[PDB]
Structure formats: structure tokens, C-alpha cells
Amino acid sequence: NLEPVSWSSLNPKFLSGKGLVIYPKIGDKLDIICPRAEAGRPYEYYKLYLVRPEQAAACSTVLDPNVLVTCNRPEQEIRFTIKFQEFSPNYMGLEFKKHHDYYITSTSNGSLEGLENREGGVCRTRTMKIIMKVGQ
Amino acid sequence: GKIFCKSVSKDPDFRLKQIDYVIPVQQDRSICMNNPLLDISDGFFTYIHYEGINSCKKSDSFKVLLSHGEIVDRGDYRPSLYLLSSHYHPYSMQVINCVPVTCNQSSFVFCHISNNTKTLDNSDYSSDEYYITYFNGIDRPKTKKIPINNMTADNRYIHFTFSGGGGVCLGEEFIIPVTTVINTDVFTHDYCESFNCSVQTGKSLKEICSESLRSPTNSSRYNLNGIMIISQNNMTDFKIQLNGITYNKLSFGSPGRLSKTLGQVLYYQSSMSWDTYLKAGFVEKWKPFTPNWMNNTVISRPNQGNCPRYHKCPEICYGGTYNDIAPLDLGKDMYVSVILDSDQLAENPEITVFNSTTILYKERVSKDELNTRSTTTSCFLFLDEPWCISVLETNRFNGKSIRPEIYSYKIPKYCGTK
Amino acid sequence: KIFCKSVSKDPDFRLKQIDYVIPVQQDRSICMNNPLLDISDGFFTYIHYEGINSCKKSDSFKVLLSHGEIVDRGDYRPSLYLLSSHYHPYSMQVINCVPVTCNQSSFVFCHISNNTKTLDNSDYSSDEYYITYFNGIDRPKTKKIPINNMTADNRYIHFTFSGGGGVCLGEEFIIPVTTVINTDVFTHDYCESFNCSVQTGKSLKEICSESLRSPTNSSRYNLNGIMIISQNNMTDFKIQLNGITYNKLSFGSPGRLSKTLGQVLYYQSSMSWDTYLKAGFVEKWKPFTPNWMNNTVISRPNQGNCPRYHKCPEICYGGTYNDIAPLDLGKDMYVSVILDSDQLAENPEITVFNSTTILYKERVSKDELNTRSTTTSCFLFLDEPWCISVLETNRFNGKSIRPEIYSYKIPKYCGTK
Numbered sequence: 005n006l007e008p009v010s011w012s013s014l015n016p017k018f019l020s021g022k023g024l025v026i027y028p029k030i031g032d033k034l035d036i037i038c039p040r041a042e043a044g045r046p047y048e049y050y051k052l053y054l055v056r057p058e059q060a061a062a063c064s065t066v067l068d069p070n071v072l073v074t075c076n077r078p079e080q081e082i083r084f085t086i087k088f089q090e091f092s093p094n095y096m097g098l099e100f101k102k103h104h105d106y107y108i109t110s111t112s113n114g115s116l117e118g119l120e121n122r123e124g125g126v127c128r129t130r131t132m133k134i135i136m137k138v139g140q
Numbered sequence: 141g142k143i144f145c146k147s148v149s150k151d152p153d154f155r156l157k158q159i160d161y162v163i164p165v166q167q168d169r170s171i172c173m174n175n176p177l178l179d180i181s182d183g184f185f186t187y188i189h190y191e192g193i194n195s196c197k198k199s200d201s202f203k204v205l206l207s208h209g210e211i212v213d214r215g216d217y218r219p220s221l222y223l224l225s226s227h228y229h230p231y232s233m234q235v236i237n238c239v240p241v242t243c244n245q246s247s248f249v250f251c252h253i254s255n256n257t258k259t260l261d262n263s264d265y266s267s268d269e270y271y272i273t274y275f276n277g278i279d280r281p282k283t284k285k286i287p288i289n290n291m292t293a294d295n296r297y298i299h300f301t302f303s304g305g306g307g308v309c310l311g312e313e314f315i316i317p318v319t320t321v322i323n324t325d326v327f328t329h330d331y332c333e334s335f336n337c338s339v340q341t342g343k344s345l346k347e348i349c350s351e352s353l354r355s356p357t358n359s360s361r362y363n364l365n366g367i368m369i370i371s372q373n374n375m376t377d378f379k380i381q382l383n384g385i386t387y388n389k390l391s392f393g394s395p396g397r398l399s400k401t402l403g404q405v406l407y408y409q410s411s412m413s414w415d416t417y418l419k420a421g422f423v424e425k426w427k428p429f430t431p432n433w434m435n436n437t438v439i440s441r442p443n444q445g446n447c448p449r450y451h452k453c454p455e456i457c458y459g460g461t462y463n464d465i466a467p468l469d470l471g472k473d474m475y476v477s478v479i480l481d482s483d484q485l486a487e488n489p490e491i492t493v494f495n496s497t498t499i500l501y502k503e504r505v506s507k508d509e510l511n512t513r514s515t516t517t518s519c520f521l522f523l524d525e526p527w528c529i530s531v532l533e534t535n536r537f538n539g540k541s542i543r544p545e546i547y548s549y550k551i552p553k554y555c556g557t558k
Numbered sequence: 559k560i561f562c563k564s565v566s567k568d569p570d571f572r573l574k575q576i577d578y579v580i581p582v583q584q585d586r587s588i589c590m591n592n593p594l595l596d597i598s599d600g601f602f603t604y605i606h607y608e609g610i611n612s613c614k615k616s617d618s619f620k621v622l623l624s625h626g627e628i629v630d631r632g633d634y635r636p637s638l639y640l641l642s643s644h645y646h647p648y649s650m651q652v653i654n655c656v657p658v659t660c661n662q663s664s665f666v667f668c669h670i671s672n673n674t675k676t677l678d679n680s681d682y683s684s685d686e687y688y689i690t691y692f693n694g695i696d697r698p699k700t701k702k703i704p705i706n707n708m709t710a711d712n713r714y715i716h717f718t719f720s721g722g723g724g725v726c727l728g729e730e731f732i733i734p735v736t737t738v739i740n741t742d743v744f745t746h747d748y749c750e751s752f753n754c755s756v757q758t759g760k761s762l763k764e765i766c767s768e769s770l771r772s773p774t775n776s777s778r779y780n781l782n783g784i785m786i787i788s789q790n791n792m793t794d795f796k797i798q799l800n801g802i803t804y805n806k807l808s809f810g811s812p813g814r815l816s817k818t819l820g821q822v823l824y825y826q827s828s829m830s831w832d833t834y835l836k837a838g839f840v841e842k843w844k845p846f847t848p849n850w851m852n853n854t855v856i857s858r859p860n861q862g863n864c865p866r867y868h869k870c871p872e873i874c875y876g877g878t879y880n881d882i883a884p885l886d887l888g889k890d891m892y893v894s895v896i897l898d899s900d901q902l903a904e905n906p907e908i909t910v911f912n913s914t915t916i917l918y919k920e921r922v923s924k925d926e927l928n929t930r931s932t933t934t935s936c937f938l939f940l941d942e943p944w945c946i947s948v949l950e951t952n953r954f955n956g957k958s959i960r961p962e963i964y965s966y967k968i969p970k971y972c973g974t975k
């Protein structure tokens with residue numbers, strides 16, 4: 005198991021320049037909790053894309069990136085468990101293997117108006133990118 | 141006859157045994173053998189799997205194995221898979237999908253071949269090719285091109301692929317599960333629109349349900365399940381028909397299955413959208429292709445994202461696992477299936493004998509945690525007793541080569557024996 | 559264009575044997591037999607068969623396929639660099655294979671059958687034919703040839719790729735092939751024109767018709783030919799099978815096509831009554847017409863009623879395969895490793911010859927050496943003509959039999975020792 009990663013603009017683990025880097029070994033669990041209804045009622049709506057390093061640097065996604073998980077419900081604690089095995093129940097396989105890099109980001113504006121905005125968004129404003137170099 | 145456990149019980153003795161001599165063992169550790177398929181009929185089976193280099197994606201495969209074999213008694217009081225013939229698909233490097241059918245004690249493989257791995261997102265079926273590869277224990281395999289030009293369709297389909305874990309032979313007609321692509325919303329969704337779930341603030345349920353049928357990589361395309369009926373005069377004068385599945389309880393296009401079992405025709409559809417419960421049913425009519433959908437409240441499948449196990453409410457979701465079922469008793473509405481006992485991860489396969497409303501009994505395959513991406517199950521009468529053979533797309537050795545596993549087991553004669 | 563082109567003695571070929579290309583089997587029961595070698599554009603393809611206690615072609619449990627490159631080592635001579643080496647996936651069912659090096663890569667055209675005698679009692683629809691292709695980096699891939707979409711110029715009942723090499727011309731492959739047909743559709747003006755003693759049994763027209771029959775199927779005839787395979791980057795194959803010209807017909811036998819000196823050279827091993835060199839450059843492709851040479855000095859040994867230098871028509875079968883390689887087109891010069899024996903397959907000799915005279919020659923070994931067939935390929939290296947030959951040798955007595963590769967240079971000056 006690993007420390008779950010709460011996906012909100014109010015999380016310190018997202019380094020202002022490097023994002024959140026993780027070095028998970030194969031067979032590790034990792035939750036990605038998207039936040040519940042926060043106390044101050046700041047509704048947080050995102051849409052996460054499994055992406056490639058080049059467009060993770062450029063912070064742009066075309067139609068081919070698959071919507072890995074979307075933070076639809078504000079009340080329900082929506083979550084996303086990951087085991088770094090090879091086989092995954094996701095569309096497009098998503099083989100993890102070992103000694104690879106895996107980048108997860110969101111291009112969305114904070115609210116639901118830009119939910120499917122794929123041009124810019126949080127990837128560069130807050131640099132909320134999860135980078136997972138397995139191994140080492 | 142029908143003398144077996146039909147009640148809720150613990151500690152079942154399936155007499156589970158693994159079969160290792162059927163599936164070949166590749167010398168290269170980097171090769172991944174993935175997406176196994178198995179279809180049994182009249183004591184003969186057809187097994188198919190894909191081989192790729194450092195990648196377990198189906199069309200990303202340089203070899204596609206096609207095996208034909210027979211069920212044989214070895215005096216063991218249990219069925220054994222006897223491999224008779226084994227060939228590689230002549231167009232393996234271009235295979236997008238294949239479906240096995242064992243017809244008249246012979247093997248038939250229906251494959252979709254294309255130069256473009258993304259053909260389903262940006263092309264049409266006139267740009268691709270479709271083949272029937274057929275052989276048995278003695279004859280050399282022969283491959284014939286399907287004349288899709290001479291095909292008749294019940295709707296304005298723009299693309300299609302044979303997608304599923306098995307097909308069916310009825311007389312001179314082959315019935316293969318297929319997933320079609322169409323670029324206009326010609327569908328209705330009374331079943332999806334009738335759910336009383338929280339309405340998401342962006343769109344309404346009619347929009348949610350229309351868009352949930354779209355391809356996730358082409359917002360302009362829709363994936364609709366269906367069947368293909370191919371009749372012929374001894375590989376002559378092919379007559380091909382493409383019919384869509386009923387609009388009652390529509391679910392996003394996904395690999396399915398047709399199986400001849402117990403005097404019936406069973407259709408299965410993998411749940412890759414928001415309705416995470418078992419989609420299966422016996423075939424009532426053929427036009428439109430109407431399976432009598434079950435109300436299963438206990439069988440689901442794991443998936444990451446917004447639609448995990450036991451999820452019911454409509455939502456724009458994509459993802460899931462393929463898990464065949466096999467009927468055991470028509471009157472008692474009993475079925476067996478190797479499902480994954482996890483909410484979001486694909487692991488811990490469990491042989492599960494179930495009702496439409498209750499789980500009857502179950503058993504883990506391995507004591508240790510086991511990765512399993514898909515399972516298929518087929519059951520049959522052997523020595524007047526019900527036996528089943530399942531294939532699991534396993535990854536027990538993480539980091540090393542991937543190879544599926546075959547298990548044989550018996551429905552328990554008595555309840556609670558250990 | 560600067561080498562010895564006259565009759566002379568004591569030539570200096572600078573002969574060297576190559577041993578590191580062909581593997582050496584630890585098992586004494588293995589027979590390494592039937593070597594094939596084709597060189598093109600600085601790359602080569604080598605093939606040979608391995609069997610257990612038997613050196614017969616279809617009686618082989620392993621078939622090696624090797625791809626490699628010609629490399630300069632600063633040695634002032636070409637060296638063979640072995641790049642890839644694989645075993646045929648259907649080796650235990652291989653009846654015959656032919657190598658082609660196309661675009662600096664290796665291509666192997668093989669015939670697979672359950673019946674080692676398929677050519678006597680079966681047909682080609684009952685068998686399968688494959689192309690196995692690979693290079694230095696890519697894993698070998700084998701594709702089945704769609705013989706269903708094949709067009710033929712005659713009513714052939716069977717065929718096998720039989721020869722020491724093929725040819726790549728643009729997008730088309732041209733492979734030598736031996737066909738089987740069960741009706742006498744042939745004429746024999748050339749054989750019938752011979753002024754030889756009439757055999758008391760049959761007439762010359764009968765002798766010449768029947769000498770084309772298979773020696774193991776009195777009802778079948780073996781006719782040489784070519785196969786033209788055009789394709790769209792291994793897609794939508796278009797395959798054509800054309801027979802050889804009826805001018806100067808000789809019983810079906812392994813042949814060769816080679817790209818040399820801007821021309822295409824065809825060779826046919828002499829396994830019938832005409833024991834002299836059958837070779838010629840290709841004029842037309844349909845029908846496959848090679849301009850046959852009128853060579854009066856190159857033959858081959860064989861036991862029985864047709865030994866070396868036999869000319870008269872006779873129902874004969876047997877002989878040895880001995881490739882040739884052209885050295886100068888204007889001077890009509892060729893080189894070949896032939897067998898210096900009347901009836902036994904022994905004493906290989908590198909021979910540079912005219913169509914009418916032998917120019918010079920040299921024995922490969924001072925000791926007696928058994929050699930059943932030889933193949934030779936020549937090329938320009940460092941602005942000089944060099945040649946490489948492979949001999950299926952048996953230097954040790956019996957036991958581990960293995961072919962040998964030799965490299966030599968055409969002598970710059972005449973009579974230097």
C-alpha cells in the first residue's frame with residue numbers, strides 16, 4: 005500500500021514545479037481520492053487524462069487520451085484504486101510493466117463550465133501532475 | 141442427470157485442476173500471450189490467443205495462435221483438452237480481432253484484418269478485410285475472404301468488427317457476435333432514461349444516455365452490439381447479413397458471446413459502461429437480435445473510475461472486464477462464471493455458481509493474490525455429469541511473461557463437502 | 559577488367575577457408591548437407607539442412623537459415639560476417655528451400671509437406687509454401703503464399719522450389735522451381751537431332767520423351783521453370799508460374815538465377831543425358847528462355863550409364879550440382895568449383911574456363927576430398943573480382959559431415975606461383 009493522493013488545489017504534495025512524483029514498485033496499491041464536499045463549500049470538478057510526457061509538458065490533450073477518471077460528484081467521495089500490475093480492467097489495456105514513466109494530469113478549469121476544457125487548465129496553473137517512475 | 145448442489149452453501153469441492161499441456165509455452169520471456177478465447181461444442185474446442193512483443197494489446201500482436209482440439213476421457217472421471225492442430229494466423233500482424241466457433245466437430249475463426257490499428261475510429265469497413273479461417277484435426281487450414289460487398293445490413297452501419305469470446309453454428313449459418321460503428325444517433329434509451337438517479341449538473345439523462353454510447357476516442361462515433369449471420373453452400377455463394385442488437389436495455393459496444401447450451405442459445409455481453417451488472421440472456425428472436433435480459437443483482441465485475449463493482453447509475457463510463465457465463469440448470473435459473481472479487485482492481489478470480497438474485501456458492505482459484513484480466517467458461521455433460529472448463533487471462537508472474545491458464549472443475553454433487 | 563584472361567598454369571587464387579560461419583555440431587550423428595548461398599549487394603543468405611544419421615534432404619530435422627554481411631577487415635580480402643541465424647519453424651516438414659537476398663535482407667522460399675514423396679503421389683494443393691524473411695535486427699517472420707490466387711501458363715500438377723538461389727528484380731522475386739505434370743506436352747527437336755547409336759529397345763523419339771519422366775513415377779514428368787512473385791509490401795500477393803523454354807529440354811533439376819554483371823544468369827544442374835554445362839543468360843521471361851551456351855569442356859561426374867563427358871541421349875538419372883559465376887562478359891569467362899572425377903563425387907577444383915577451353919584450375923585440397931555439389935558467387939571487392947564458394951564436404955571419415963566455405967581472388971596476372 006501507498007499513501008493515497010487527494011486530488012485538490014489544496015494539497016501540498018503537488019510541488020509548485022515538479023508536480024507530485026512517486027516511485028512505486030510493482031504490486032503496490034495507490035488510491036487517488038478526489039475530494040469530498042469541502043467544509044468551505046468550494047466545489048471541485050476535474051477530469052483526469054492518462055497522458056504522455058511530451059503533452060504533459062505542453063499541457064494539451066487531443067481526442068485520443070482516455071478520460072481516466074472524472075470528479076463528477078461533490079458529495080460522494082469518488083476514488084480510484086491502482087495496483088501496478090500489468091493487466092488492468094481499463095479500456096486500452098494500460099500495461100504498467102517496470103522501469104517506465106506514467107503521467108496523470110487534468111486540463112480542466114476548477115468548475116464544471118470548463119470540465120472538458122482540454123487546452124490548458126490545472127496542468128500549468130497549479131502544476132497538479134502526478135508522475136510515477138516505477139522502479140529505481 | 142440433474143443431480144447436483146442447488147442451494148446456498150459453503151466450502152464447495154469443485155475438484156479444481158489446472159491444465160498446462162494445451163497452451164504452448166513461448167521461449168521468449170518478453171512475449172505476452174494475451175486475450176484468450178475458448179469455445180467448446182460437441183466434444184471439440186477451438187482456442188485462440190494473441191502473442192505480442194513487450195505489449196499485451198490485441199491488435200498490437202505479431203502472432204495469433206489458433207488451436208483445434210477435442211475433449212477426451214483418459215479414465216480420469218473428468219474432461220481433458222486434447223490438442224490436435226495448432227497453426228498461426230496468416231495475417232497475425234494485421235489482426236484487429238478474432239472470434240472462435242467450433243462447427244460440426246471442426247474449428248472456424250472469424251477475424252477482422254486491417255492495416256490501421258485505429259481503423260474503428262477513422263475508417264470504414266470497405267477499407268478493411270474480413271476472413272474465415274477453418275480447419276480440423278487432419279485438414280490443412282484454409283482462409284477465405286468474406287465478401288462484405290455482398291453483405292446486407294439492417295441499418296446504416298459504417299464499420300464493424302467480430303468482437304467476442306465465441307460464436308455459434310446453426311445449420312448452414314454461422315452467428316458471430318459483432319460490434320458495429322455508426323456515426324448518427326438512431327437509438328432510443330427507455331431503459332437508461334428510466335433510472336431514478338441523481339442527474340449530473342452538466343447534462344440531462346437523455347443526453348447522458350445518448351453520449352454514453354459514443355466511442356471514447358471519436359465523439360462522433362457510436363458503438364452498437366449485434367450479430368453477423370453467414371450462410372453458405374460448402375464455402376460457396378456466401379450470404380452475409382448484419383443485424384443489430386435490440387434497443388431494449390442498450391449498453392455500449394463491447395465483446396460478447398453466443399453459446400449453444402442446454403438446447404438454448406445464450407448471449408453474453410461484457411459490461412463496459414455504466415450498467416455494471418451481468419448482461420446476458422437467451423435468444424428469443426433473431427430479427428431484431430433480442431436476448432431476454434436477466435435481472436442479476438449479484439454478479440458484476442471490477443473497474444477503475446466512476447463505474448466500479450455494483451455500480452448502477454447511468455454515467456459516461458468506459459472500462460470493464462470480460463467474464464463469460466455458462467448455464468447449469470434452466471428450471472432453477474442457475475449459472476456459473478469465473479468473476480473477479482474486487483471492486484476496482486482485476487484480481488482474485490472466483491468460480492461462482494449463482495442465481496439471478498443470490499450467489500449460491502463460490503471458491504477462490506488461488507490462496508495468493510492473482511492478477512486476472514478476463515475469464516471465459518464453458519460447461520458440458522461428461523459421463524452424465526456436469527463439467528466445466530475455464531480460461532483465465534492471468535498475470536501471476538509480474539514482470540515475466542504472461543500466459544493464460546486453463547482450469548477444469550465439476551459442479552458439486554452434494555452441498556458442503558470438504 | 560584487369561585480371562588473367564588467358565590459358566596459363568599455376569594460378570594464385572589466394573585461397574582461404576572460412577570455418578566460423580557454418581556452425582559445428584557436437585553430435586556426430588548430424589549430417590550438415592545441401593548448402594545454399596546467395597550474395598547480393600554486399601549481403602548473403604546461407605541455408606543448410608541438418609539430419610540424424612542421414613544426409614537426405616527431406617530426411618532432416620533442422621534447417622538452418624543464416625543472414626550476413628560482407629565486411630572489410632583491412633585484410634585486402636572479403637570476410638563473411640554472420641549476422642542472424644535461425645532454425646526453420648517447420649523444419650521437419652521441409653521438402654526444399656531456395657535463398658534470395660533482397661534489399662540487403664534474407665528471404666527463404668520453402669515447400670512444406672507431410673509426404674516426403676509428395677512429388678510422386680500428391681499435388682501442390684495438398685502442400686503449403688512459405689516465405690521466411692528476416693535481417694540483422696528484425697525477428698524472422700514467415701508468411702504463407704496464397705497459391706489459390708496463382709496463375710499458371712500450363713496444366714502443372716506439382717512444384718517445388720529447387721535450386722541454389724533466386725533473384726530480386728524491383729518488387730518481383732524470381733525463384734527457380736521444378737514442376738510436375740502428368741501429360742507429355744513437350745517437343746524434343748534438340749534431343750531428336752542427335753546422331754548417336756540407336757538403342758535396340760526404343761527409338762530416339764521415345765528415348766527423349768521418356769528421359770523427361772520422373773525416375774520414380776513413370777507417369778510423371780519433371781520440367782524446370784521459374785516463379786514470379788510481385789507484391790505490395792507483403793500485401794495482396796500476385797504469383798505467376800512460368801515454365802522453361804522447350805528448346806534444349808533437360809530433366810527437372812535444381813537450378814539457379816543470379817544477378818551478375820548487369821545480366822541475369824540461369825544455371826541448370828545436368829542430371830540427365832546431356833552431361834555438359836547447362837547455363838545461359840535470360841532473354842525472355844515468358845516463356846523462360848535462357849540463351850543456352852555451347853560449352854564443350856564443363857561436365858560433372860556420375861556413376862552408371864552417364865558418367866562425365868557423356869553426350870548421347872539415354873534414360874539416365876544422377877549427377878552433381880555445380881554453380882557457375884561469370885567473370886567477364888566480353889571475354890565469355892566463367893568460374894566454377896567442379897569435380898575432377900569421371901564417376902565419383904570427389905576432388906573439387908576451382909576452374910576458370912571459356913565456353914570452349916579451360917583457362918586455369920586449382921585443387922581445393924591436396925588430399926582426396928568428397929564433395930557432392932558446389933556453389934559459387936563472385937563480386938567486386940576493392941575494385942577486384944573475388945569469389946566465395948561453398949562445398950558440402952566430408953573431410954573427416956563419415957561422422958560429423960559439414961560444408962566448407964572458401965574465398966579466393968581471380969589472379970591479377972597469369973602464371974604466378
Ligand SMILES: *[C@@H]1O[C@H](CO)[C@@H](O[C@@H]2O[C@H](CO)[C@@H](O[C@@H]3O[C@H](CO)[C@@H](O)[C@H](O)[C@@H]3O)[C@H](O)[C@H]2NC(C)=O)[C@H](O)[C@H]1NC(C)=O
Nearest residue numbers: 145146147148149472473474494495496497498499500501
Ligand atoms: C434462488 O432464487 C429464489 C427466488 O427465485 C430463492 O427462493 C427462495 O428463497 C428462500 C430464502 O432463502 C428459500 O428458503 C425459505 O426458507 C424458509 C425457512 O423456514 C421457508 O419457510 C420458506 O418457505 C423458504 O423455503 C426458498 O427455499 C427459496 N425458494 C424455493 C422454491 O426453494 C432461492 O432461495 C434462491 N436460491 C437459494 C439457494 O437460496
Ligand SMILES: *[C@@H]1O[C@H](CO)[C@@H](O[C@@H]2O[C@H](CO)[C@@H](O[C@@H]3O[C@H](CO)[C@@H](O)[C@H](O)[C@@H]3O)[C@H](O)[C@H]2NC(C)=O)[C@H](O)[C@H]1NC(C)=O
Nearest residue numbers: 067260261262263264298321322323357358359360361362
Ligand atoms: C470521427 O468519426 C467520424 C465518423 O466516421 C469521422 O468522419 C469522417 O471523417 C473523414 C475524415 O476524418 C471525412 O472525410 C471524407 O473523406 C473523403 C475522402 O476524401 C471525402 O470524399 C469526403 O467528402 C470527406 O472529405 C468524412 O466525411 C467523415 N464522415 C464520413 C461519413 O466518412 C471523423 O473523421 C472522425 N474524426 C476523428 C478525429 O477521428
Ligand SMILES: *[C@@H]1O[C@H](CO)[C@@H](O[C@@H]2O[C@H](CO)[C@@H](O)[C@H](O)[C@H]2NC(C)=O)[C@H](O)[C@H]1NC(C)=O
Nearest residue numbers: 111112113114115116117118119120121122125
Ligand atoms: C474555465 O473555462 C470555462 C469554459 O467554459 C470558462 O467559462 C467561460 O468563460 C468565458 C470567458 O472567456 C465566458 O465568456 C463564458 O461565458 C464562460 N462560459 C462558457 C460556457 O463558455 C470559465 O470562465 C473558466 N474559468 C473558471 C471556471 O474559473
Ligand SMILES: *[C@@H]1O[C@H](CO)[C@@H](O[C@@H]2O[C@H](CO)[C@@H](O)[C@H](O)[C@H]2NC(C)=O)[C@H](O)[C@H]1NC(C)=O
Nearest residue numbers: 677678679680715739740774775776777778779
Ligand atoms: C504416378 O503419377 C500418376 C499421375 O498422377 C499417379 O496416378 C494418379 O494417382 C492419384 C493418386 O493415387 C490419383 O488420384 C489419380 O487419379 C491418378 N491418375 C492421374 C492421371 O493423376 C500415380 O499414382 C503415380 N504413381 C505412384 C504414386 O506410385
Ligand SMILES: *[C@@H]1O[C@H](CO)[C@@H](O)[C@H](O)[C@H]1NC(C)=O
Nearest residue numbers: 287289290291376377378379
Ligand atoms: C450479391 O448481391 C447481388 C445484388 O445485391 C445479388 O444478386 C447476389 O445474389 C448477391 N450474392 C452473390 C454471391 O453475388
Ligand SMILES: *[C@@H]1O[C@H](CO)[C@@H](O)[C@H](O)[C@H]1NC(C)=O
Nearest residue numbers: 243244310311312313374375
Ligand atoms: C454442419 O452440419 C449441419 C448439419 O445439419 C449442416 O446442415 C451444415 O451444412 C454443416 N456445415 C458445413 C457442412 O459447413
Ligand SMILES: *[C@@H]1O[C@H](CO)[C@@H](O)[C@H](O)[C@H]1NC(C)=O
Nearest residue numbers: 331332333334335336337338
Ligand atoms: C424508480 O422508478 C421505478 C419505476 O417508476 C420505481 O419502481 C422505483 O421504485 C423508482 N426508484 C425509487 C428509488 O423509488
Ligand SMILES: *[C@@H]1O[C@H](CO)[C@@H](O)[C@H](O)[C@H]1NC(C)=O
Nearest residue numbers: 433434435436437438496497
Ligand atoms: C428485475 O430484478 C429486480 C431485482 O430484485 C426485481 O425486483 C424485479 O421484479 C425484476 N423485474 C421483473 C420484471 O421480474
Ligand SMILES: *[C@@H]1O[C@H](CO)[C@@H](O)[C@H](O)[C@H]1NC(C)=O
Nearest residue numbers: 563564565912913914915917
Ligand atoms: C576462348 O574461346 C575463343 C573462341 O571461342 C578462342 O578464340 C580463345 O582463344 C579462347 N580463350 C583462350 C584463352 O584461348
Ligand SMILES: *[C@@H]1O[C@H](CO)[C@@H](O)[C@H](O)[C@H]1NC(C)=O
Nearest residue numbers: 660661727728729730791792
Ligand atoms: C526492394 O528494392 C526494390 C528496388 O527497385 C523496390 O522496388 C522494392 O519495393 C524493395 N522492397 C522489397 C520488399 O522488394
